[PDB]
PDB file of C-alpha atoms and ligand atoms in Angstrom:
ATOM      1  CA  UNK H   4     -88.892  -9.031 -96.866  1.00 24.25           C
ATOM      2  CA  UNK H   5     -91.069  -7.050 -94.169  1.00 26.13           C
ATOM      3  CA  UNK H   6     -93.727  -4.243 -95.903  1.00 25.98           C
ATOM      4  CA  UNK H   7     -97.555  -3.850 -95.059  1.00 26.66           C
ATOM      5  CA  UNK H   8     -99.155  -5.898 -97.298  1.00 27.29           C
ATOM      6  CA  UNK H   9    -101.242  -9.211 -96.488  1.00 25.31           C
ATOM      7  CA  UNK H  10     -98.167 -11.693 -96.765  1.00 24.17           C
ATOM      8  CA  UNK H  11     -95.819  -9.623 -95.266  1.00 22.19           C
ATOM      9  CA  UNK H  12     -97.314  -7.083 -92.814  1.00 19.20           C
ATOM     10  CA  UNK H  13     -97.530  -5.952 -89.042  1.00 18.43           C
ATOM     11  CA  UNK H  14     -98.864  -9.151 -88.193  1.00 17.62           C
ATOM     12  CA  UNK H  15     -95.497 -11.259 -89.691  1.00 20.42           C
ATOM     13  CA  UNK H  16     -93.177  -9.075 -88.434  1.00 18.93           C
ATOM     14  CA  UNK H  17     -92.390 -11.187 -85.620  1.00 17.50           C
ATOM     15  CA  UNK H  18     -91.270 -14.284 -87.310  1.00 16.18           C
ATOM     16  CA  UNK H  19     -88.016 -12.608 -88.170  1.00 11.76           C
ATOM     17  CA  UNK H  20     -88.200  -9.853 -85.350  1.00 15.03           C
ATOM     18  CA  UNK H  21     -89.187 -11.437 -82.263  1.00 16.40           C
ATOM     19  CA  UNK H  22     -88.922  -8.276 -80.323  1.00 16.83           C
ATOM     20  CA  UNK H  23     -92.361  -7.493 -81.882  1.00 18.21           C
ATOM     21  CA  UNK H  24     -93.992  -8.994 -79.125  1.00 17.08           C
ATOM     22  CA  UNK H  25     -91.584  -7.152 -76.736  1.00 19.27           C
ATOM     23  CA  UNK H  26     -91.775  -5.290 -73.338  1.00 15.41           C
ATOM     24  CA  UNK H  27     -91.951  -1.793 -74.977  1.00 13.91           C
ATOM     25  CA  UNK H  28     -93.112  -1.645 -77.863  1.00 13.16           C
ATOM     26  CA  UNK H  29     -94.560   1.022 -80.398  1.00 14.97           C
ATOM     27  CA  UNK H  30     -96.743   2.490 -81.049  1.00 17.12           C
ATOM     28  CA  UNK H  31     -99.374   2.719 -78.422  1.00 14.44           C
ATOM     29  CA  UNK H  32    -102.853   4.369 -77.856  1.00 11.38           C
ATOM     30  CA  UNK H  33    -102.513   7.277 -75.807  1.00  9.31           C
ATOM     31  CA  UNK H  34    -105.560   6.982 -73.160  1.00  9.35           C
ATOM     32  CA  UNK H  35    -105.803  10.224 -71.815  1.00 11.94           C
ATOM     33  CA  UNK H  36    -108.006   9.581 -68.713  1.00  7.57           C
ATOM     34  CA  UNK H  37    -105.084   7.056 -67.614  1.00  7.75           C
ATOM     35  CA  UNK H  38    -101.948   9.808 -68.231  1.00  9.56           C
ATOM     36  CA  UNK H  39    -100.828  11.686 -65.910  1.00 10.60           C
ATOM     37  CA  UNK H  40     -99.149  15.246 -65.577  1.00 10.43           C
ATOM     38  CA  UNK H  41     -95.666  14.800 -64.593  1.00  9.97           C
ATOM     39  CA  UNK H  42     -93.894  17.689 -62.984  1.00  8.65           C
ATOM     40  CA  UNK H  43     -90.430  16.671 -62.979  1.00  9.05           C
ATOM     41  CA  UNK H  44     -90.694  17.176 -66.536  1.00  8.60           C
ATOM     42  CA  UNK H  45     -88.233  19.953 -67.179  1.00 10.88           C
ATOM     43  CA  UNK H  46     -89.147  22.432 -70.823  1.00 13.80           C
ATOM     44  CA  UNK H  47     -88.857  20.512 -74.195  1.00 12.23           C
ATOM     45  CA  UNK H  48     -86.077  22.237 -76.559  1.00 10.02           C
ATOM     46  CA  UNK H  49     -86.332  21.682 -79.986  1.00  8.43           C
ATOM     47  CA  UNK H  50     -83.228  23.611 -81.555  1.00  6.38           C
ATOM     48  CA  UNK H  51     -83.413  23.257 -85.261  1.00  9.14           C
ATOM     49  CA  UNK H  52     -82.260  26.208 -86.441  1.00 14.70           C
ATOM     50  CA  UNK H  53     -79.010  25.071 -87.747  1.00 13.72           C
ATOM     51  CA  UNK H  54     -80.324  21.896 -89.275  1.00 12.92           C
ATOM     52  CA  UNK H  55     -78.405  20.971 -92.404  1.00 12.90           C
ATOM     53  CA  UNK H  56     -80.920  18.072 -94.808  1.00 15.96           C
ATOM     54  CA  UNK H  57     -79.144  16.462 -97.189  1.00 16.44           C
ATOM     55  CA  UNK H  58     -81.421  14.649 -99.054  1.00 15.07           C
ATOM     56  CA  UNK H  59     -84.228  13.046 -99.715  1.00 14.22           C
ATOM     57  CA  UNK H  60     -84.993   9.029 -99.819  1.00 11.06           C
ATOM     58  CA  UNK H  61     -87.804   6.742-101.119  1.00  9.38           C
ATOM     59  CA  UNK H  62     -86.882   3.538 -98.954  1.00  7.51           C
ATOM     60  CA  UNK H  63     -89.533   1.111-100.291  1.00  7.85           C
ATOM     61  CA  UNK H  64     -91.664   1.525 -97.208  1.00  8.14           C
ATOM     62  CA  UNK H  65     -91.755   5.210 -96.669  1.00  8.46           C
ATOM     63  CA  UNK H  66     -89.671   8.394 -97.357  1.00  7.62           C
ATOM     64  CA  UNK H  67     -86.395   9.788 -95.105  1.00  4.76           C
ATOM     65  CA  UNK H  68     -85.717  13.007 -95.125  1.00  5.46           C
ATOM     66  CA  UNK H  69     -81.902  12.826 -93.799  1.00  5.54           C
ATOM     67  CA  UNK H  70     -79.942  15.321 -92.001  1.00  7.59           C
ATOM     68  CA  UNK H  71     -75.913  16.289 -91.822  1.00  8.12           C
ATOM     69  CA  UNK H  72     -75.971  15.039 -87.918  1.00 11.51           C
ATOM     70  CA  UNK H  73     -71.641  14.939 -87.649  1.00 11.28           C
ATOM     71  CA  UNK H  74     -72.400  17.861 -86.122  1.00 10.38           C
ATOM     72  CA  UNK H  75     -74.385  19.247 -82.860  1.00 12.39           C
ATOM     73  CA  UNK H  76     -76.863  21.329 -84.814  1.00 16.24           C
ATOM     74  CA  UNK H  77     -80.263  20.138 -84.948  1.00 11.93           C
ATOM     75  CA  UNK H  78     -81.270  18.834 -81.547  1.00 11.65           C
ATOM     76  CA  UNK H  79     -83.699  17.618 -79.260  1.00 11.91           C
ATOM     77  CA  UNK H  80     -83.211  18.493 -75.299  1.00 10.96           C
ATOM     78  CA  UNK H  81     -85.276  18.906 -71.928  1.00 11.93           C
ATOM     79  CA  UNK H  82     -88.453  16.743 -71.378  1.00 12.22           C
ATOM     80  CA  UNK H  83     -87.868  13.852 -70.318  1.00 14.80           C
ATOM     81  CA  UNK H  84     -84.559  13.879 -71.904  1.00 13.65           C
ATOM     82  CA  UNK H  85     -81.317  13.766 -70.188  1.00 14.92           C
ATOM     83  CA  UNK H  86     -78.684  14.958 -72.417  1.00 14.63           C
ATOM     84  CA  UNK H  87     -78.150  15.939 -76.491  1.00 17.44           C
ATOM     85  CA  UNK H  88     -80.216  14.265 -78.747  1.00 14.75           C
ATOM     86  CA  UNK H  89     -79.104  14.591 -82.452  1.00 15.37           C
ATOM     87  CA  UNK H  90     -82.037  14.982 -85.242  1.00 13.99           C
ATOM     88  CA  UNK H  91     -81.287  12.458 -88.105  1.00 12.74           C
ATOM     89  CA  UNK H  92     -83.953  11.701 -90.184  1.00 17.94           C
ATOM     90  CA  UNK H  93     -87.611  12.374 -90.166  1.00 18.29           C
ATOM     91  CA  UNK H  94     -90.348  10.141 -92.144  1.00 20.11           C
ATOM     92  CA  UNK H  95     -94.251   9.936 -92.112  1.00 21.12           C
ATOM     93  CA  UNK H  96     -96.403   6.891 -91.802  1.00 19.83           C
ATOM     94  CA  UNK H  97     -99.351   7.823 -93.625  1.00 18.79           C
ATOM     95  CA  UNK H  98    -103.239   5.887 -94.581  1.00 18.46           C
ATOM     96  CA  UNK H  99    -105.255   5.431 -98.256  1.00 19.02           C
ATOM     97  CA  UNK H 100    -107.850   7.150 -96.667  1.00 17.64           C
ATOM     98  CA  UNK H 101    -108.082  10.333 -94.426  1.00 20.53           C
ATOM     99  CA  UNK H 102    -109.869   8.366 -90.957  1.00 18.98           C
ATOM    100  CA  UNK H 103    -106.507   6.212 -91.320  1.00 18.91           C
ATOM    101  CA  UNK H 104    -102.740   6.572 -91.163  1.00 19.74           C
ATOM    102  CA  UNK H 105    -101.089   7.736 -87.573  1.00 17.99           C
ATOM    103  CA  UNK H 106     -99.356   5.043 -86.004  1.00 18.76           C
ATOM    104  CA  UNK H 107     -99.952   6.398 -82.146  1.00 18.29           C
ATOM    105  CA  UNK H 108    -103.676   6.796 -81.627  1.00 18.67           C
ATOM    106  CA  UNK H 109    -105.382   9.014 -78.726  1.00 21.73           C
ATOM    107  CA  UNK H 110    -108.222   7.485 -77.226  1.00 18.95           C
ATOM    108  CA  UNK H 111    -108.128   5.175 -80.181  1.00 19.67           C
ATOM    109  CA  UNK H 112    -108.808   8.021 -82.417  1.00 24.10           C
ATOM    110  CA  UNK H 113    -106.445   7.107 -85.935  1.00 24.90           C
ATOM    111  CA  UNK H 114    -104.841  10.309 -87.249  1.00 27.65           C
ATOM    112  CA  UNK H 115    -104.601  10.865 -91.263  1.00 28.25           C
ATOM    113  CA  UNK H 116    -100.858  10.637 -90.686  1.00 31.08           C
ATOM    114  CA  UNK H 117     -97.596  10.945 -87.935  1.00 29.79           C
ATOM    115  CA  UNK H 118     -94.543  12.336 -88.681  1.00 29.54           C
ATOM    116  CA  UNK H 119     -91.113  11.329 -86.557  1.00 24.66           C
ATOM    117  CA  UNK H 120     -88.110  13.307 -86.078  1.00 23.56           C
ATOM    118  CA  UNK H 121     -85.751  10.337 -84.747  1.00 24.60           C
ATOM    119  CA  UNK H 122     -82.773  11.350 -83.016  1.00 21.95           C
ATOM    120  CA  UNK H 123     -79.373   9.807 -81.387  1.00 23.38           C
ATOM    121  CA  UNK H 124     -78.203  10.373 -77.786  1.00 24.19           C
ATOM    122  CA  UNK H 125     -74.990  12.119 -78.288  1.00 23.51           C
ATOM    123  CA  UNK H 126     -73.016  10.116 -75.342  1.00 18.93           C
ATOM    124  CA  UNK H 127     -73.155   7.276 -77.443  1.00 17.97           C
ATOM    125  CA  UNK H 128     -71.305   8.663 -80.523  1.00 17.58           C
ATOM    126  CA  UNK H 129     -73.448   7.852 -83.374  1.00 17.69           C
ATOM    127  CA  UNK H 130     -76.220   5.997 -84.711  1.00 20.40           C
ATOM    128  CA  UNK H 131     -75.291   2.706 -84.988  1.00 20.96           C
ATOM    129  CA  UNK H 132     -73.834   2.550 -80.911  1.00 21.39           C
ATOM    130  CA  UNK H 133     -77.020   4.530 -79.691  1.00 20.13           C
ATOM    131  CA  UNK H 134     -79.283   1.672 -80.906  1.00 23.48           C
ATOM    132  CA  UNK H 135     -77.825  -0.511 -78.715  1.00 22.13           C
ATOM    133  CA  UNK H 136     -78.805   1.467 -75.641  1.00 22.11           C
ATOM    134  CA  UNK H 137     -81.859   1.581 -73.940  1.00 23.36           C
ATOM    135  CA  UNK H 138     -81.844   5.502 -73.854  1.00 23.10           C
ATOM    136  CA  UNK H 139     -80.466   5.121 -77.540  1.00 26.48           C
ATOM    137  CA  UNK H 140     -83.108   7.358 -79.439  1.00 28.86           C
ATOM    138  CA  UNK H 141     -85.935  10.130 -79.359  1.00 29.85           C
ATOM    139  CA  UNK H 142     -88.651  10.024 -81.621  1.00 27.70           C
ATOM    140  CA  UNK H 143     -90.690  13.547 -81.944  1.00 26.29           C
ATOM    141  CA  UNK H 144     -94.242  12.411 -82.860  1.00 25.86           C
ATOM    142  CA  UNK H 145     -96.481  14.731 -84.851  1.00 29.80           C
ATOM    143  CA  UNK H 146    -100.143  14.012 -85.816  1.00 29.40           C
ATOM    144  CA  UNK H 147    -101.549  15.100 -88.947  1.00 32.33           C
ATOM    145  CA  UNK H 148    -105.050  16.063 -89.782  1.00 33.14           C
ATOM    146  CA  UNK H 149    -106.346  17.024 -93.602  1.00 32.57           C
ATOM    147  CA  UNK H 150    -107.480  21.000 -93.304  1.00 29.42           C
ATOM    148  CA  UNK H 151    -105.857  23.823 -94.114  1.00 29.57           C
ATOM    149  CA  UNK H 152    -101.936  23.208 -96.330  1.00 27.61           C
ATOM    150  CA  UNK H 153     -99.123  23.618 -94.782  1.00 28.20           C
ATOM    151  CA  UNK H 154     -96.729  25.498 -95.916  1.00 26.84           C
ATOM    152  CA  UNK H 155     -93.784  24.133 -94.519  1.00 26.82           C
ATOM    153  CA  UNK H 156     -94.062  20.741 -95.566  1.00 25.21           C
ATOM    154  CA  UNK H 157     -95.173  22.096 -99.461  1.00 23.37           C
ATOM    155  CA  UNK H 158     -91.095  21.559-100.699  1.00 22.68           C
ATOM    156  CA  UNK H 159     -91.567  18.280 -99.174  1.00 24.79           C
ATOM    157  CA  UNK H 160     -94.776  17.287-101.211  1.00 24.92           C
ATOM    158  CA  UNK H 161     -93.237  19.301-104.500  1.00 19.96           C
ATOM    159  CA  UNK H 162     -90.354  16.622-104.684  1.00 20.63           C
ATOM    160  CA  UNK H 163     -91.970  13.567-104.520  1.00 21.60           C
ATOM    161  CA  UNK H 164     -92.424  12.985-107.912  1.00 19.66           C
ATOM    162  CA  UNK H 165     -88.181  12.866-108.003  1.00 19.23           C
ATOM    163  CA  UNK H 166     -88.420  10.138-106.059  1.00 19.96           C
ATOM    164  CA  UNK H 167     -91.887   7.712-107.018  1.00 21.32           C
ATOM    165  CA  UNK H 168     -90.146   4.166-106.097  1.00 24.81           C
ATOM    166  CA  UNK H 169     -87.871   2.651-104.343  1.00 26.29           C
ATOM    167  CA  UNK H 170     -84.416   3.319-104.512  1.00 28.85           C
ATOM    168  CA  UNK H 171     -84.590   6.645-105.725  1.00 28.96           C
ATOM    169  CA  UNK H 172     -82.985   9.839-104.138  1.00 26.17           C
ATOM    170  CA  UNK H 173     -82.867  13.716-104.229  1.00 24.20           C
ATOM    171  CA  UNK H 174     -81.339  16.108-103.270  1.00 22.77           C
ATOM    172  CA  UNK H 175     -82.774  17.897-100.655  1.00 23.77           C
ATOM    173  CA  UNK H 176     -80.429  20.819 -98.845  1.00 24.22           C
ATOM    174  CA  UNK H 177     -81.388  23.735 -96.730  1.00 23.99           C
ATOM    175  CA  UNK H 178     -84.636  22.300 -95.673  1.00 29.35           C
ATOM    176  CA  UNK H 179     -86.172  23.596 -92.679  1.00 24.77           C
ATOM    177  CA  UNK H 180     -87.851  21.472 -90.030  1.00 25.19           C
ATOM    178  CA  UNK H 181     -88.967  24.152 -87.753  1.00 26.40           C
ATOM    179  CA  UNK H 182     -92.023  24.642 -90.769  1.00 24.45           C
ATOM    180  CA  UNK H 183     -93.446  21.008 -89.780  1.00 22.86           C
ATOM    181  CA  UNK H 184     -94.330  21.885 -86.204  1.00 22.81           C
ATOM    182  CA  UNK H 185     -97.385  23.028 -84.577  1.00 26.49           C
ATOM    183  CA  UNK H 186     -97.739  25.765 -82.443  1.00 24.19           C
ATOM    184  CA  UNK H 187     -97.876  24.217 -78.783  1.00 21.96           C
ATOM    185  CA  UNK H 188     -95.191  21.408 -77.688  1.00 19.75           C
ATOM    186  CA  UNK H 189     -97.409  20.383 -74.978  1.00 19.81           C
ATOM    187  CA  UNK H 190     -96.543  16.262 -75.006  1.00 19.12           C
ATOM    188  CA  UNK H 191     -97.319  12.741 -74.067  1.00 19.72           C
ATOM    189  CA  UNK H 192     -94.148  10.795 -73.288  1.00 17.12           C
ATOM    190  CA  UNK H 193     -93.298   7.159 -72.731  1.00 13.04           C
ATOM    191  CA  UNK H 194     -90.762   4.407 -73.091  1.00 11.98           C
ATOM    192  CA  UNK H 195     -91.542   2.370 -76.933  1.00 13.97           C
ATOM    193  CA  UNK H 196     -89.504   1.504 -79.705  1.00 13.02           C
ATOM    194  CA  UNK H 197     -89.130   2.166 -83.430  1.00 12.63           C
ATOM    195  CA  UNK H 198     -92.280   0.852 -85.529  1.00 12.35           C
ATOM    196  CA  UNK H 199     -90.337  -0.378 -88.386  1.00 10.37           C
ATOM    197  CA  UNK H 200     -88.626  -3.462 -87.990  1.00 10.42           C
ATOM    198  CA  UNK H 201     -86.253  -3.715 -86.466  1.00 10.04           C
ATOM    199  CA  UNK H 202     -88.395  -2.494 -83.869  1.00  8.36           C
ATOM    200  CA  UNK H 203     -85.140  -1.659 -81.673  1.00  9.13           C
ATOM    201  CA  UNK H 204     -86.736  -0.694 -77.736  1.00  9.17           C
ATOM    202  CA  UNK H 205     -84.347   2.230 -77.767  1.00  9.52           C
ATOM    203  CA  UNK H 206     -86.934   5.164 -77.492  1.00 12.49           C
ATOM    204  CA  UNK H 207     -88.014   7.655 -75.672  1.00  9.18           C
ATOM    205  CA  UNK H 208     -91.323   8.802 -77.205  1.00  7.00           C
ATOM    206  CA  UNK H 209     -92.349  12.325 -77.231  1.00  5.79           C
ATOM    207  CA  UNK H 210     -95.890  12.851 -79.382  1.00  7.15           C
ATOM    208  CA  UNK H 211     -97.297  15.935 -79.463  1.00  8.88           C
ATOM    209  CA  UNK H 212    -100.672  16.720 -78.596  1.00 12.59           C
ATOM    210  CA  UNK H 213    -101.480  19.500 -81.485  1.00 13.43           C
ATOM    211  CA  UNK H 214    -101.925  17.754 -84.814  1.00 11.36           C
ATOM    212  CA  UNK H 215    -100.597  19.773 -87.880  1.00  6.47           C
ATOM    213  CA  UNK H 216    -103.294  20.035 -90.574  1.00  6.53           C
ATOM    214  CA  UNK H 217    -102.165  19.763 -94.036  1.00  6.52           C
ATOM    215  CA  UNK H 218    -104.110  19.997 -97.563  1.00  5.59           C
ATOM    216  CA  UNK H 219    -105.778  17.134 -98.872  1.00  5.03           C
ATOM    217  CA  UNK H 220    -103.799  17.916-101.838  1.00  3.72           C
ATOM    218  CA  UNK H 221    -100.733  17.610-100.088  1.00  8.99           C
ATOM    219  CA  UNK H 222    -101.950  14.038 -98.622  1.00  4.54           C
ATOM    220  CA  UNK H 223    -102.971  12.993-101.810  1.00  3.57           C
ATOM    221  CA  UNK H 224     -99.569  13.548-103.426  1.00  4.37           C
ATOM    222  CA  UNK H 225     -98.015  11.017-100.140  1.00  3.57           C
ATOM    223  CA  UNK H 226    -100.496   8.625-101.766  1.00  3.68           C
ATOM    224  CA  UNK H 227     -99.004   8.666-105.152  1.00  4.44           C
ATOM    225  CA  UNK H 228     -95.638   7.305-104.156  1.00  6.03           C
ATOM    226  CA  UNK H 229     -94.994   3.563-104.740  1.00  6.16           C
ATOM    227  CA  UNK H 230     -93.676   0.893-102.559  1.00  6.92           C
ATOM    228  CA  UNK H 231     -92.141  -0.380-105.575  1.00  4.91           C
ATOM    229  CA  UNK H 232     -89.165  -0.179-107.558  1.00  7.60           C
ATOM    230  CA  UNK H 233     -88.911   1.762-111.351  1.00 10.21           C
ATOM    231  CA  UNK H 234     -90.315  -0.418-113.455  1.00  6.81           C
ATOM    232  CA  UNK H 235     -92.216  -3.050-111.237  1.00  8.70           C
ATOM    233  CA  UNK H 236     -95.861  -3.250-111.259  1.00  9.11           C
ATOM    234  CA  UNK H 237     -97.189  -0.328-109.344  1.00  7.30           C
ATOM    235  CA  UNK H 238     -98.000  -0.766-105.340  1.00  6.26           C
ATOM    236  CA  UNK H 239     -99.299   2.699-104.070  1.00  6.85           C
ATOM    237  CA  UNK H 240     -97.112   3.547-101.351  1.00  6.37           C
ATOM    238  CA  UNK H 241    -100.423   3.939 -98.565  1.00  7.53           C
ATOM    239  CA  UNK H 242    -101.426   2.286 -95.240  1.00  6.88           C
ATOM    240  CA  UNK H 243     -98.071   2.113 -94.022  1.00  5.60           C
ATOM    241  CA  UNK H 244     -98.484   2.244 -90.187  1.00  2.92           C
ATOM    242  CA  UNK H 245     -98.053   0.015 -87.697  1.00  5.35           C
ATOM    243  CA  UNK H 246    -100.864  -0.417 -85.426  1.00  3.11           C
ATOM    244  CA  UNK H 247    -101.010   0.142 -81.636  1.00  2.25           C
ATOM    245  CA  UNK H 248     -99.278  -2.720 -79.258  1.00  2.00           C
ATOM    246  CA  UNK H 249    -100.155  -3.350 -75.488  1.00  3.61           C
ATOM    247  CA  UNK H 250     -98.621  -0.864 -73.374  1.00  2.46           C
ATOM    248  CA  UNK H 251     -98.359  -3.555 -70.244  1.00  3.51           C
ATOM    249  CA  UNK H 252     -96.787  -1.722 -67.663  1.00  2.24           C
ATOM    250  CA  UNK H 253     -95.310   1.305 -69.487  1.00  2.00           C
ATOM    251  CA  UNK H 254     -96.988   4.832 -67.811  1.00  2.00           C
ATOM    252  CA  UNK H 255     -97.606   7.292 -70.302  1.00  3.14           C
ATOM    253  CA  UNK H 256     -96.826  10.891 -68.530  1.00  6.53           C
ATOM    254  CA  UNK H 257     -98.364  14.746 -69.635  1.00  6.84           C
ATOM    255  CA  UNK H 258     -96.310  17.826 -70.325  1.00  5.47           C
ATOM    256  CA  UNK H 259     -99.622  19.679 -69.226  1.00  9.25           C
ATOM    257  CA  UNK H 260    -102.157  19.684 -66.658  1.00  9.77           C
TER     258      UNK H 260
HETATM  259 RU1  LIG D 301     -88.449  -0.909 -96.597  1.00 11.00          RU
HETATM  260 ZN1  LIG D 302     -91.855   6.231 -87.992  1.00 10.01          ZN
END
C-alpha cells in the first residue's frame, strides 16, 4: 500500500487516490510576497489546557499521538474558524537530513520537520461525519528547526523506543500539548487537505509562522523509528513528507501585517 518509498510514494498516490491531483490540495509553499493580511481574521484560541492523550501510535508511516476528544476539552477556535474544533491527534512529518522534512514550505524554504494538531468541527459530531464536510477539519501547522531542545516535546522523544515499528502502541496519558508551541501564533491560513492519503479536502490550514527549534538529539531519535513491522527488515522511518502541490486559485491570507 501507499508509504514514501520509490514504488510507492507521493508520486503514486494518485492511482488509488485520485483526489491527489485535486482542487485543494496540501501542502503548499507559502509565498509570502503573494499573502496577504486579512483583517476579518478574528484572535486564534488554542485551549489545551484540559487535553486528555491517551496514547501513543507507530502507524507504519509516522507516529499519532491521540487524544480523549468525547469531550469539549482540547480545542481550536477564532481565526478563520467558525465554530469548535476538537484536537484529536497530532503527528510530525519529518526528513533524513536537517535541510529536509516540513511538508509546507515558505518561500520554498524546507523545514527539518512540521508538526499537525488535526482537529474535528464539533457540528458534525465526530470524526468520521466531519471528513465528509468541506469545513470538516483544522490542521495546526508547526515548523521545526534543529537548535536549542525542547523541552516539551522531550516525553515525546523518551518513548519512542516503546514503539520502533509498526503496529506498536503506548501508553501515553497526561501529556501536554501546550509544551509543543512557540511563542507567537501569528499564522498563514488557507483552504488544503490532509497530506496522507486519503488526502480528504476537508481543511482549513492554519501554519504558524514561528518554527519551534528542537535538539538534534531529539531529531535524531524521530530518525530511529522504522516504517516497518517487528521483525521485518529494517526501513528507517525518515523522509516522510509530502511535497508542495499547486495552489491554483486558493489565496493564502496573514494573521499579521
Ligand atoms: Ru501508514
Ligand atoms: Zn500531517
Amino acid at each position: 500500500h501507499w508509504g514514501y518509498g520509490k514504488h510507492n510514494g507521493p508520486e503514486h498516490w494518485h492511482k488509488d487516490f485520485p483526489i491527489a491531483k485535486g482542487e485543494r490540495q496540501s501542502p503548499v509553499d507559502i509565498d509570502t510576497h503573494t499573502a496577504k493580511y486579512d483583517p476579518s481574521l478574528k484572535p486564534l484560541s488554542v485551549s489545551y489546557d484540559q487535553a486528555t492523550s491517551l496514547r501513543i501510535l507507530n502507524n507504519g508511516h509516522a507516529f499519532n499521538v491521540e487524544f480523549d476528544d468525547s469531550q469539549d476539552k482540547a480545542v481550536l477556535k477564532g481565526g478563520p474558524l467558525d465554530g469548535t474544533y476538537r484536537l484529536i491527534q497530532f503527528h510530525f512529518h519529518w526528513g533524513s537530513l536537517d535541510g529536509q522534512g516540513s511538508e509546507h514550505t515558505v518561500d520554498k524554504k524546507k523545514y527539518a520537520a512540521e508538526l499537525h494538531l488535526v482537529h474535528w468541527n464539533t457540528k458534525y459530531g465526530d470524526f468520521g461525519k466531519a471528513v465528509q464536510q468541506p469545513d470538516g477539519l483544522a490542521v495546526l501547522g508547526i515548523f521545526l528547526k534543529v537548535g536549542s531542545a525542547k523541552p516539551g516535546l522531550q516525553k515525546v522523544v523518551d518513548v519512542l523506543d516503546s514503539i520502533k515499528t509498526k503496529g506498536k502502541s503506548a501508553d501515553f496519558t497526561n501529556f501536554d500539548p501546550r509544551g509543543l508551541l512557540p511563542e507567537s501564533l501569528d499564522y498563514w491560513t488557507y483552504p488544503g487537505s490532509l497530506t496522507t492519503p486519503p488526502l480528504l479536502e476537508c481543511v482549513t490550514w492554519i501554519v504558524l509562522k514561528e518554527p519551534i527549534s528542537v535538539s538534534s538529539e531529539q531529531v535524531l531519535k524521530f530518525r530511529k523509528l522504522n516504517f516497518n513491522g517487528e521483525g521485518e527488515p529494517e526501513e528507517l522511518m525518515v523522509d516522510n513528507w509530502r511535497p508542495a502541490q499547486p495552489l491554483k486559485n486558493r489565496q493564502i491570507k496573514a494573521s499579521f501585517k
